[PDB]
């Protein structure tokens, strides 16, 4: 019934049938992206029309197409031919990754480079990576992947321990041509293995860890209805899944007495970029747009009970399309559970004699994705007190290189001869806000220091200032941790019982933003990552901070083009885009497999409620 | 057996006897502080000598004394008379709290102020607050408390809902004189109650929460020996307790193979200040030094199983002295337990076919204190991967005032006519470092951006720089979140297998430091709070960042005086002092009892180990 329900296998099969009947999905076509469109703005609107957006690639080299289909009515709504040299290439296909290593194994330049290093081609793995846009004019309008080589000594060996530095190749994956092979010189291949399940490396396993048992004897406190609608401790929301963005939260609302009060209409991680900071020509092109180029939902893991998710777990198993339009289920791809979260509130009062303690808990919605060497966990948390938090967990195996003799300013040493280039992991959260409805505004709040003098004779006073962002051209903001800067999203037409506008406050971690030179290719393609906060007026087609087609696309799309419209955002339907990330100088302890590091953000009520919203929590 | 064992009831009883026989503990004497002294520096220290430091107050007006006694030998080691106008007053005594309300209840100025407001003196509670040092020359050398009034409508009523603004009194608690009563005008006393257990306010309690059962069927993974020595998952440490500082961690070390490697010699929260930013003369003097003036350990809560600490809990019950030298047990004052902490490391490798997941855990050592309206939880965490983290949890009831007609730049409105002045909560962690031994140094690490040009043709490179702090005069540092600034504590004489000095990196939260004007009394007395990081050379008597006697001390004591010695800290026995805090603009949701907010810091290994230290964690 719900328009926000997960896509079903039948819906995906029906999209395939509709495309086939329309003549759009013959044997030379491949589906590079397929996802459900959210309902347009309008309460009720069209009753039931589930629409899907499809990007269709052609392996014969014909122009690709963007197609919108109505699965309800069995019709193609629109189909447009794309000029990829202008608007960008489609996302990378899983089947294109395998092509790179195979093509290189028969290229005379590649074989000659490996022979110079006394390497057996049968043992050389090639990491196929997105190409970006640089100085190679022949790449415009072609689908290019770039390949970096690693040696696998035996089938269970971690190839990441054995990078083949000084060598890179570029491959046209449609015409199946190796365009360039670049060899800047022989580096020793690091010889130490990185096999973290080898007892020679682990030593004997610990026998000291006693079990921790987390159980819910009466079951969990949340309910799931309609497949993906959650009700938990006054919160209400729908859990969506999109092959590009991964988990998407819809319709986040809080039940305050008799009233269901909206907070966030749609929350997602709408892009994530991983730029590398090594100026070697072997790697200076390396920038992953995991969301926009690779599609993080496509690579979601099946999560194992007791290992990945511990406790009383409820799973969702989202369905995506494969490259031919057949449904593929990601079994146990989303874990949901509640967690104890320590003390919520506590006070022992001398004068009244009352001692009061209450415990907190949070609802957790998570998934994990694996892109090559890296593994990322995406965690959304809802707390009893109205706080919403996102946390990204980064782990996996660091990307490696040789460590140059004499050292490096841009690479860490992990093991003898083994380096790890400096890089960042930067996320963009897209928060389509709906604080008590859609009439919202953003205020920047700074601490204000005051000078000792008249009206402040003891020099103790301090204050704060709020500045309303009224137009998009002034809504590109930077962090300032030293002034305690936060941003408040409020509804100027909905007041609390003190006659102040209701609001939520965004607390950032204030980590560095994109470090690359502003003139670089990556700064132009990932312009969102250069500033901490952007606010736009809502528009149906403004979905991603990097635009629709990120692969091999120059600048020109995404947030800088949206904000040029300079739209009114003072008490309007607005979207907050928050950039946050980790700057990774790898340490020895990250090798041979990296312990989790985290980054995120949170939103806390700011006069949204008329008093604490957790006065009705029982004592247990 | 261990020199670091908790003080026992028998030890305190023996101190009382020694003082009594020496003639130092007559009926006019009160113990304001008593604590065990740490062993002096000595890698061959064998002969047991348990020494206690005592501050003795005299209620008849005679000079107080600082006394050191040896419990082992039954002797007074030293006894010095204190000139408090010079070096500061002794900490506030619990018995002096009651004296303020009783003295004001018979003062004709106070009674006339209450009569104008139609307040029954029997219902007026007085919060007894520390005085600080301001313009009143008559207070130098006298023990002063200041009192602010709150109305309790009935014995179980929350008086904090009913502040009596416009009224403050100063009291000499030794001569039992009311020195000043200041009445700046009548403000309405806010009438709404704040009784968070009243069903009229809570509404019906939730019936939706289902239980979360956390058990350890084989018991916990840590061992406790000698009363307070912990071994857990390669970690080794001693858990101390001091009536001023609270929980103190000693001898933090990590067992790396067959070697016990020291990391931190002593960790404590050595001061915490709560400065208020309301310029009203009723409150412009208000600054709590909860550690230095009140002693946070003496107000530690007894923690209840299943409410305060959930899971398989091991308790410590520290012993302190009362004002007469009798031992007093704080039953269940410290909770220790381990808890699951999500994913530790995870990777699914395409090329090897190996799927790997391990879970993380942390050891938790905590206590809770209550000082008047506020309640603070102090949490130390040890993680499997070598991370050490501190977290403070702030809750309780916010301090209130009237909300002025026409509003305020320095006070939030919480309820009709009820205000909450702006304030901060600022902590100082004192970390006596011992990274692989005592020869340590500190480096400041900044991210370095690079410009596009030769050697960086694509404009992607970035780097970092490290600056060694070589003398105390250059070791007062500020945060810089925009450049990703961290501090590394390393041992230049102990190298990892890559021939780099072993180290640990301190990650701050980069919250604002003290906001008061630099010329203010509070900036002088809480100078530590004006900067994020200080490094000193270790000295036995440099224990607190604010000096030994904080109460009514005129300023400059502690860190500014220590740093002025300008000692060598480059490869020496050093102490790191980290300032961190919360800036609190109270929100409606903080009333009538405030949900927990948190702040803290963490330390992560930085080439301390030769590879990841958690390769031997089993799958379970
Ligand atoms: Cu990384
Ligand atoms: Cu506060
Ligand atoms: Na919106």
From Swiss-Prot, chains A, B:
<dbReference type="InterPro" id="IPR000269">
    <property type="entry name" value="Cu_amine_oxidase"/>
</dbReference>
<feature type="disulfide bond">
    <location>
        <begin position="309"/>
        <end position="335"/>
    </location>
</feature>
<keyword id="KW-0479">Metal-binding</keyword>
<dbReference type="InterPro" id="IPR049948">
    <property type="entry name" value="Cu_Am_ox_TPQ-bd"/>
</dbReference>
<dbReference type="GO" id="GO:0009308">
    <property type="term" value="P:amine metabolic process"/>
</dbReference>
<feature type="active site" description="Schiff-base intermediate with substrate; via topaquinone">
    <location>
        <position position="374"/>
    </location>
</feature>
<feature type="binding site">
    <location>
        <position position="423"/>
    </location>
    <ligand>
        <name>Cu cation</name>
    </ligand>
</feature>
<feature type="binding site">
    <location>
        <position position="584"/>
    </location>
    <ligand>
        <name>Cu cation</name>
    </ligand>
</feature>
<comment type="function">
    <text>Catalyzes the oxidative deamination of phenylethylamine to phenylacetaldehyde with the concomitant production of hydrogen peroxide and ammonia.</text>
</comment>
<protein>
    <recommendedName>
        <fullName>Phenylethylamine oxidase</fullName>
        <ecNumber>1.4.3.21</ecNumber>
    </recommendedName>
</protein>
<keyword id="KW-1015">Disulfide bond</keyword>
<comment type="subunit">
    <text>Homodimer.</text>
</comment>
<dbReference type="Pfam" id="PF21994">
    <property type="entry name" value="AGAO-like_N2"/>
</dbReference>
<feature type="modified residue" description="2',4',5'-topaquinone">
    <location>
        <position position="374"/>
    </location>
</feature>
<feature type="binding site">
    <location>
        <begin position="371"/>
        <end position="376"/>
    </location>
    <ligand>
        <name>substrate</name>
    </ligand>
</feature>
<comment type="similarity">
    <text>Belongs to the copper/topaquinone oxidase family.</text>
</comment>
<keyword id="KW-0560">Oxidoreductase</keyword>
<dbReference type="InterPro" id="IPR049947">
    <property type="entry name" value="Cu_Am_Ox_Cu-bd"/>
</dbReference>
<dbReference type="InterPro" id="IPR036460">
    <property type="entry name" value="Cu_amine_oxidase_C_sf"/>
</dbReference>
<dbReference type="InterPro" id="IPR015798">
    <property type="entry name" value="Cu_amine_oxidase_C"/>
</dbReference>
<dbReference type="GO" id="GO:0048038">
    <property type="term" value="F:quinone binding"/>
</dbReference>
<feature type="active site" description="Proton acceptor">
    <location>
        <position position="290"/>
    </location>
</feature>
<dbReference type="GO" id="GO:0008131">
    <property type="term" value="F:primary methylamine oxidase activity"/>
</dbReference>
<dbReference type="Pfam" id="PF01179">
    <property type="entry name" value="Cu_amine_oxid"/>
</dbReference>
<dbReference type="GO" id="GO:0005507">
    <property type="term" value="F:copper ion binding"/>
</dbReference>
<dbReference type="InterPro" id="IPR054157">
    <property type="entry name" value="AGAO-like_N2"/>
</dbReference>
<feature type="binding site">
    <location>
        <position position="425"/>
    </location>
    <ligand>
        <name>Cu cation</name>
    </ligand>
</feature>
<keyword id="KW-0186">Copper</keyword>
<feature type="binding site">
    <location>
        <begin position="288"/>
        <end position="299"/>
    </location>
    <ligand>
        <name>substrate</name>
    </ligand>
</feature>
<dbReference type="InterPro" id="IPR016182">
    <property type="entry name" value="Cu_amine_oxidase_N-reg"/>
</dbReference>
<keyword id="KW-0801">TPQ</keyword>
